[PDB]
RNA sequence: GCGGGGUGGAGCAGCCUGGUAGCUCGUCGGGCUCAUAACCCGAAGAUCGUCGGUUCAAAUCCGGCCCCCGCUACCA
């Protein structure tokens with residue numbers, strides 16, 4: 001009986017270790033808006049409130065999300081700094097330490113959150129915030 | 130509390146502990162700092178919950194946390210059982226512990242390395258130990274396929290499918306994995322959810338259990354007002370223990386009288402019962418437990434009562450010094466890089482007698498066809514008539530598994 | 539593990555040249571018992587001198603081979 | 619981030635108390651002995667980690683990196 005197995009070998013191989021959509025940003029008075037903040041987060045398996053909370057906290061500015069997944073930052077910030085703070089977000093909350101996949105989950109327990117790689121399988125413990 | 134005891138045998142550094150880490154998450158610490166530069170040295174320990182995605186497709190349906198929304202969708206996967214592992218070491222010399230460990234297993238998984246010459250010394254040594262003791266519920270696993278040619282891992286699967294022939298291993302399936310990137314593990318959970326079934330155990334039986342660790346919980350500095358009791362780690366096999374029972378440990382501590390030797394049974398009360406990190410009021414076979422006691426933690430610091438057993442206080446068990454083994458030999462020494470043919474037993478020879486979890490040394494007084502009589506340094510409490518044992522010899526400085534049999538009373 | 543060792547000739551009394559063995563971890567290895575065992579292998583006098591063993595005569599190969607027999611790594615031992 | 623240490627071939631002194639580099643593994647010469655050892659005397663060998671600073675003078679005192687070692691003792 002090889003079929004069952006050969007199958008198994010297939011299925012693991014297809015689990016090994018997707019550029020990132022360019023995050024569209026604009027300005028309207030004194031707001032900076034990330035047209036696809038929703039899609040973006042969506043394609044990194046991360047909750048909007050989270051990228052929002054982080055990204056906002058770092059910005060030291062207020063804001064919430066469109067009913068149509070858009071980020072309205074109550075402050076007019078330069079397209080650039082947004083990315084700089086955004087990658088930093090990726091580094092600390094999405095990228096696997098073991099192999100750097102970016103193909104991860106984000107556990108949570110009493111007070112310990114963990115990054116969980118869908119490729120390598122390892123768990124980078126992160127500072128719940 | 131965990132249902133069953135699955136062992137992870139295999140050669141050294143093939144990643145046994147690592148596979149345990151992809152399945153549970155847990156590491157075996159690798160501790161004593163020494164293990165941290167070396168490798169697993171005590172039996173590692175870890176537990177996990179296996180539920181299944183009814184509401185979708187397998188093997189992936191084989192879950193780990195009450196969460197199906199990982200594959201297909203949501204319907205909180207149904208819980209099948211909670212299992213436990215026993216990570217042995219892999220080093221040619223930790224043989225004496227791994228043996229010991231098997232005594233607790235209800236089944237196993239042979240981790241071969243995909244990028245090293247198939248029958249590697251210890252891989253075999255283990256395998257035959259398995260077919261010898263009785264652990265017949267086996268799953269071979271091809272580990273490091275994340276570092277090989279798509280040809281290589283299949284040709285190894287060949288040499289495996291060919292070894293697994295004449296031997297007792299019909300359809301012992303072989304599930305190639307990647308313990309490093311945790312790939313394909315779910316089909317492993319499906320194997321181990323099929324083949325390593327959870328044995329029934331009559332509870333009514335005599336409460337009997339094996340010990341393989343023991344610790345002094347107490348932190349460097351805890352005051353005497355809250356010195357937490359002595360703590361005995363091991364696995365139950367038959368019966369069931371409950372909080373507040375009266376218990377004894379065998380053969381138990383030996384006295385000293387001017388060069389004399391004399392072991393004797395230790396009594397105490399089960400102060401407490403714990404599996405993993407969660408406390409329970411009772412405890413039943415499959416798993417390792419830990420038993421809080423009321424005895425001076427000096428008595429079980431480093432792992433003193435290693436190879437000791439715990440039973441019902443006021444129970445009938447022999448503390449032998451001399452034992453009747455019936456027995457058989459391998460024709461080869463599968464465990465040296467060299468396969469030199471097993472010399473028959475000469476009397477007045479020192480041999481390691483591995484009985485239960487314990488590891489004792491003893492000298493041969495009688496040499497018949499398959500019944501030798503052995504004199505022991507440290508007593509063996511023989512709980513049954515069914516006492517499996519494993520017999521070894523110091524071949525070239527390092528000890529080696531050479532044959533087996535059955536204790537006889 | 540990681541226990542290296544040096545075995546070489548060391549000036550002595552009557553005979554020709556003693557044999558010096560050093561490099562053992564004295565907190566784990568009892569040199570007194572090791573020396574007694576080595577003295578039986580070489581059938582010569584000897585003592586533990588500080589953290590070394592000194593044997594009378596030239597028994598470098600004998601000692602090295604016995605140490606391997608006793609479980610010490612072949613690759614941890616150097617005869618000079 | 620703390621603090622210990624780089625000295626003839628190996629392993630250790632000498633440095634806060636600046637000018638004298640000492641000790642053990644074999645070599646060479648001369649003694650002792652009838653002779654071998656042992657013992658004795660006389661000999662070979664060191665840019666003292668490096669880039670500089672203070673001084674009459676720096677192994678030694680003050681800073682700059684380069685490798686070396688340890689840090690308050692480990693979890694049912």
Ligand SMILES: Nc1nc2c(ncn2[C@@H]2O[C@H](COP(=O)(O)OP(=O)(O)NP(=O)(O)O)[C@@H](O)[C@H]2O)c(=O)[nH]1
Pocket residue numbers: 140141142143144145146147148168169170217218219220272273274275276306307308309310
């Ligand atoms: N590339 C790759 N490396 C792996 C894989 N599995 C384990 N390793 C590596 O193998 C090393 C050995 O891990 P370890 O689990 O200690 O091996 P072990 O077999 O458990 N040691 P012991 O035999 O004593 O229990 C680890 O450093 C790990 O990185 C694998 O599937 N792929």
Ligand SMILES: [Mg+2]
Pocket residue numbers: 146147157159168169
């Ligand atoms: Mg290990």
